[PDB]
Amino acid sequence: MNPIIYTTLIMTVMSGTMLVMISSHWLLIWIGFEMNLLAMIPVLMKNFNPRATEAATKYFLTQATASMMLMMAIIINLLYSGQWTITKMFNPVAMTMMTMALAMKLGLSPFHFWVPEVTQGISLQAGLLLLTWQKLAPLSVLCQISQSINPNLMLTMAMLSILIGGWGGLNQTQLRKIMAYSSIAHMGWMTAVLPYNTTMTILNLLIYITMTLAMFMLLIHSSATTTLSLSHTWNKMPVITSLMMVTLLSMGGLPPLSGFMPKWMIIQEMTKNESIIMPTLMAMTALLNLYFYMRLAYSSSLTMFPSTNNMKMKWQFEHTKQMKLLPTMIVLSTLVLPMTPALSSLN
């Protein structure tokens, strides 16, 4: 792929997302989703191989199904009120269809099957994009129509997402599938608080995006995609594995780290709306994500795995390419809890 073409495609992906975010008309929001998908399919196949082809094919099928459903919901809403403005849906059936379409676009359980496969099938750069930027548009749409949505369906899908993210992540040795199941659980957390406070959704999304960017950039810097391949990084770049260890604990949600702030804010907001039970389940279940993060930290930084003889040659070479925002991302992923009251600026 020509660099100019790659830049044009990244700009088209971002402009489709921005079209979803600035539009007042349901048709323009649908067009934004279409443009985003159109430009996004080639970015998945940038490094050509059968696995990338299969991942792009599964992605296209899932997202195009979601798109058809989304359009059908818009048309039913128009049928029961001559309205194109995205405010609150008028028809309950249209709202159910819309909620399921956006859940399929996000990869919430029970529509979660596509996320691990597509993430495993692509490169780490495309995985970074898929798991950070591809969430903004459906979440913004869900934030706009939040009053209309039925709490029972949303919270069911969110609790399923948390449970299934934890359970599925427990079984992985590939790092891309670990990141994908992590993403599924995080999405569950973001959508559980949506019918109550969209500011908490936005805060959770920002912190999750920061931590995910940090993790993916650390995985690119130490070009590893399996657990055993990441077990070597200590014998070449120990600072990288220490920083990854601390970022892993922040993802786990352990205090005094930043990762704990979204969980803390979400539980508190829910208790205000007289919902003690849902949160107790959510935290006790996030314990599973913490377990497999801790396992990765055990194999990667807290112990030393055996190494190979050819590592000595790598000892003599510096990294050709350096990531400009990696240092800032780590600091924002770990050390930002004392700044929590700054969330008021988000509303």
């Binding site: 709490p151 069911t156 007289e274 039970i277 849902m278």
Partner: peptide, 15 residues
């Protein structure tokens, strides 16, 4: 116990 005390699983957005 939840039926007796009025516990809510899928609580409505009161506030």
């Amino acid at each position: 116990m939840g039926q007796l005390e009025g516990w809510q699983v899928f609580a409505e957005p009161k506030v």
